[PDB]
Ligand binder design. Structure first.
Ligand SMILES: OCCc1ccccc1
Ligand SMILES: OCCc1ccccc1
Ligand SMILES: OCCc1ccccc1
Ligand code: NA
Ligand code: NA
Lengths: 333, 332
């Protein structure tokens, strides 16, 4: 098990991670977008300042590290991550992998080539910065496309060679997690190296627990996502859902109750800029959840405690689980 | 418009000289080159390859090239500026959107896209101050809803700035007709537009009817041929099975029908190409070792041999590009 986690400011020891949000973003965009059209966000400086305010408030609430799951295709700008991390004094773990908007240069690649690209970002550094990714993000939106199966396979190969974990975006509704697990296992990846994300997007407790029993980490990262009260905004309802934050949060207690407290990872899946959706989605979202990344520690944790979840289980979920997941871990020979 | 914007700054119209109007330093994807430069060996190797090729094209008489790589073709203006300076060849950069826009672009309105194109033309690309001198758009058969928005924004940006629009077409499907209709619906003058990849079709009637309306016809795929590589499906699909002589003859055909002033010729070459199968670059380089120098070293002489006069060849390679590139607003 690795003693250090790579962050945008360099390696940190496992104990330095502390309370960690495992699925967040500084900015949800597209490759090259922030640099070619920063004005879409007011300005690069305005976006950085917003991110610094948010990260400082989240830090005030106890968050010590966030995992920015923005891949190349989410328009991840590591320089921006490094700048905000330093200004707000919050650890930020960067990601490699590919989401669902890969451009042609990526979509035409073989599993072997993609493996090399993920390894480059983890081992040598993203772009020419030397900033090394500490996680691999992948995704499916229903049955995987042929390209998506290749990405999952490359992600598994990169994880097996480096020990860095894999985290995913799923259509929880469709039970994407099972197909994802299938692919990963076909590559020999240990389930403990994988977090099946957006799992609170569904009430299927059956699905969730079956994956947990196999060793997978379950990502309940859309807790504050809700279009309740905005049933009239189609784009918003489509993205956020009509289930309440309490409904989603209750899934955490359910999994704990079923005996899988060690496999749960909680997050907000928040961001400070969002260009890969309708214009104005950021504003809508910020009105929905003004606490932003602080929602987890300020609302969710107290809610669960009020529901009977003990202190130690809450601490285990927010500190222990993320540390074990993030610690680079190679499969035993 | 007395000046054309290049990656090294503005040049007078006369300084453009012999110009290739549809080329690329590298055919890629947004952020690709910076994130995975080893795909091309290294950024340095790519730059060096580009400088060698531009120097050879320059030796053959090329003074300027128009790199029609848009944001989504992975245009890296810093690379363009570096190679332009090292080889001493003017390079005109482009704005616009090709056929691989990411979500952040695909979800935008015509109004939003218009401001993005204007940003690139008027103020500068990224934080470099390098201003685009052309707008590139594309369709591959009937336009998608998004492509119609892109074409409309391109026309709006062209009307406000005077910079021309150039396109990628599925020529055999007559895309230029729909493109022209959309452009015309926005009030853009056909003389501000080049319907590209026109040599991909043998339908002279389609080409002369567009010429007749005032559009520029881009015969920019001259050296593209898979003749001899039938066995290579990817190469075949990309380059076609028509010879370079057959395509070059369309230049003569258009001249013979009276449209010499509406012809733009190029090679549609590149030094790196990641937006297709791996190894396509090597295959292409074997097919056409002359690369960008193909037009001046083989096509011009071929046309001359076929009877095209000196003056017409000079007009097509110098005059036409100058007229097209000179920013021109619609009269009031
Ligand atoms: O507008 C400044 C508000 C702010 C102050 C300090 C840290 C986060 C928020
Ligand atoms: O030892 C049990 C402490 C703990 C509880 C919840 C999740 C991880 C660790
Ligand atoms: O008569 C003008 C000379 C000329 C020839 C071909 C194209 C542009 C100009
Ligand atoms: Na590493
Ligand atoms: Na300009």
């Amino acid at each position: 098990t690795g003693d250090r986690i790579n962050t945008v400011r360099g390696p940190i020891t496992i104990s330095e991670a502390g309370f960690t949000l495992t699925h967040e973003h500084i900015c949800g965009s597209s490759a090259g977008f922030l640099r070619a059209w920063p004005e879409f966000f007011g300005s690069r400086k305005a976006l950085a300042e917003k991110a610094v305010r948010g990260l400082r408030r989240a830090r005030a609430a106890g968050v010590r590290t966030i995992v920015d799951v923005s891949t190349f295709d989410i328009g991840r700008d590591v320089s921006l991550l490094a700048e905000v991390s330093r200004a707000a004094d919050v650890h930020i773990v960067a990601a490699t992998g590919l989401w669902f908007d890969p451009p042609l240069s990526m979509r035409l690649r073989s599993v072997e080539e993609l493996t090399q690209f993920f390894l480059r970002e983890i081992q040598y550094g993203i772009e020419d910065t030397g900033i090394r990714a500490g996680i691999i993000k992948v995704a499916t939106t229903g049955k995987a496309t042929p390209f998506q199966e290749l990405v999952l396979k490359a992600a598994a190969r990169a994880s097996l060679a480096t020990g860095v974990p894999v985290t995913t975006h799923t259509a929880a509704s469709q039970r994407d997690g099972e197909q994802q697990a299938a692919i990963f296992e076909s590559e020999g990846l240990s389930p403990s190296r994988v977090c099946i994300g957006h799992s609170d997007d569904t009430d299927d407790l059956s699905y969730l627990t079956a994956l947990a029993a196999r060793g997978y980490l379950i990502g309940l990262d859309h807790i504050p996502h809700s279009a309740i009260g905005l049933e009239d905004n189609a784009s918003a309802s489509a993205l956020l859902g009509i289930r309440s934050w309490q409904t989603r949060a209750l899934l955490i207690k359910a999994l704990i109750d079923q005996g899988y407290m060690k496999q749960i990872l909680v997050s907000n899946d928040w961001l400070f800029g969002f260009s890969s959706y309708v214009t104005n989605i950021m504003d809508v979202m910020d009105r929905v959840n003004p606490d932003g990344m602080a929602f987890i520690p300020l609302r969710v944790i107290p809610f669960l405690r009020e529901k009977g979840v003990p202190q130690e289980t809450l601490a285990g979920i927010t500190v222990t689980n993320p540390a074990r997941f993030l610690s680079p871990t190679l499969r035993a020979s």
